[PDB]
Amino acid sequence: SHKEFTKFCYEVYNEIKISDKEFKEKRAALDTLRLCLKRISPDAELVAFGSLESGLALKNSDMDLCVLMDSRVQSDTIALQFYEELIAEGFEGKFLQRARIPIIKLTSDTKNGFGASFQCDIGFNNRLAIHNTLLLSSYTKLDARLKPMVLLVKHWAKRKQINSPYFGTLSSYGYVLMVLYYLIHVIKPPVFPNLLLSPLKQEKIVDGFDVGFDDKLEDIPPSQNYSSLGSLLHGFFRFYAYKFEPREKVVTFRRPDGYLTKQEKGWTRYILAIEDPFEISHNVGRTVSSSGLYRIRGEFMAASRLLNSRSYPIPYDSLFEEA
């Protein structure tokens, strides 16, 4: 059936999605940060990436931004000038540099009226993140079931304390890729085709990596999978609870059949292996510890058993209860 679960999923979705009010205030903040950047560098561009831009944002989400500029202009100097302009405009935050890469982390706004807890990361020439955002955004436009599924999965992982990359578990971006991997390579018939492996895909090289994918979306047939949101979600929990083998296999978007061993890849950290679709040398689940994977798997298992429970009424609310 899944009819009652599907209705429940849409109810939670509507409550957890970013409201129009917040989306418009984030867009106002971006306009303001663009003004500050203009004052310091008229040639540079400020762009948004991540879930706000791909349309996969929950209420009260952080902002992910990137300054694009000529690569012959050195990034740390403009980063510093931008940072100083932001501080002078009443933003609070930190300027830092890991290796060669400068980063501004804004944690507050004291003047412009965007909040005491305005949270915004600003990277410099992070072109790959823009591209992986274009990808996720394309999938979001290809099937209306993607957005609510992702939001629910993210909300679930937050509630269960398995969405903490600094504490041994997995980034939200890692969960989005796990969803996508399920929708492309696991479910039958597929919800999505693999856009990177399309015969119509044109190579595009950016910072060493191929970021090409078929983006002519209006020529792609609709899915021949007709599952409700509830059934999709139950399938997803089931696959990562019982079928996926994290010790041996890699979540990937580079194989026609989605099959890849950690060994071929050289990924013996690698407790959980998710190959980024573009930056194929980057394991997105590298933050996942041995205990974190246990808890992640335990929660996939618990979600599966709840949706499979023969004891009615099924307490669906418990899917989003704080572990």
Ligand X SMILES: O=c1ccn([C@@H]2O[C@H](COP(=O)(O)OP(=O)(O)OP(=O)(O)O)[C@@H](O)[C@H]2O)c(=O)[nH]1
- 52 vs 86, beta carbon nearer ligand X: 52
Q: What is the largest CA-CA distance in the chain?
A: 64
Q: Site mask, Mg ion, residues 46-65, x = CB under 5 A?
A: ----x-----------x-x-
> Is 172 labeled as ligand-binding?
yes
Question: Which tokens belong to 1?
Answer: 């059936």
Nearest to 240 by CA among 315, 321, 157, 164: 157
> Is 164 labeled as ligand-binding?
no
> Is 129 labeled as ligand-binding?
yes
Residue 156 interacting entry, from ligand X, Mg ion, none, C-beta within 5 to 8 Å by type: none
Q: According to CB under 5 A, which residues from 63 to 102 bind Mg ion?
A: 64
CA distance 101 to 116: 27
Residue 260 Cβ vs ligand X, minimum distance, rounded to whole Å: 18
- 212 vs 227, beta carbon nearer ligand X: 212
> Is 14 labeled as ligand-binding?
no
> Is 62 labeled as ligand-binding?
yes
Residue 278 interacting entry, from Mg ion, ligand X, none, C-beta within 5 to 8 Å by type: none
Residue 42 Cβ vs ligand X, minimum distance, rounded to whole Å: 26
Binding site for ligand X (CB under 6 A): 49-51, 56-58, 61-62, 64, 129, 132-133, 171-173, 176, 284
| Number of Cβ atoms within 10 Å of the Cβ of 267 | 16
> Is 17 labeled as ligand-binding?
no
Residue 18 Cβ vs ligand X, minimum distance, rounded to whole Å: 10
- The angle, 0 to 180 degrees and rounded to 10, between the axes of the packed helices 146-159 and 290-308 is 120
Q: Compute how many residues bind Mg ion; rule: CB under 5 A.
A: 3
Residue 176 Cβ vs Mg ion, minimum distance, rounded to whole Å: 11
Residue 133 interacting entry, from ligand X, Mg ion, none, C-beta within 5 to 8 Å by type: ligand X
> Is 282 labeled as ligand-binding?
yes
Residue 313 Cβ vs ligand X, minimum distance, rounded to whole Å: 31
> Is 173 labeled as ligand-binding?
yes
Residue 170 Cβ vs ligand X, minimum distance, rounded to whole Å: 9
Q: According to CB under 5 A, which residues from 114 to 133 bind Mg ion?
A: none
- 149 vs 176, beta carbon nearer ligand X: 176
- 129 vs 229, beta carbon nearer ligand X: 129
Nearest to 44 by CA among 12, 98, 13, 85: 85
Whole-number Cα distances in Å, 257 to 44, 179, 187: 41, 16, 12
- 18 vs 307, beta carbon nearer Mg ion: 18
- 194 vs 287, beta carbon nearer ligand X: 287
- Where is the binding site, in residues? 51, 62, 64, 129, 132-133, 154, 158, 172-173, 282, 286
Which residues in this chain contact Mg ion in the complex, by CB under 5 A?
A: 50, 62, 64
- Where is the binding site for UTP, in residues? 51, 129, 132-133, 154, 158, 172-173, 282
- Where is the binding site for ATP, in residues? 286
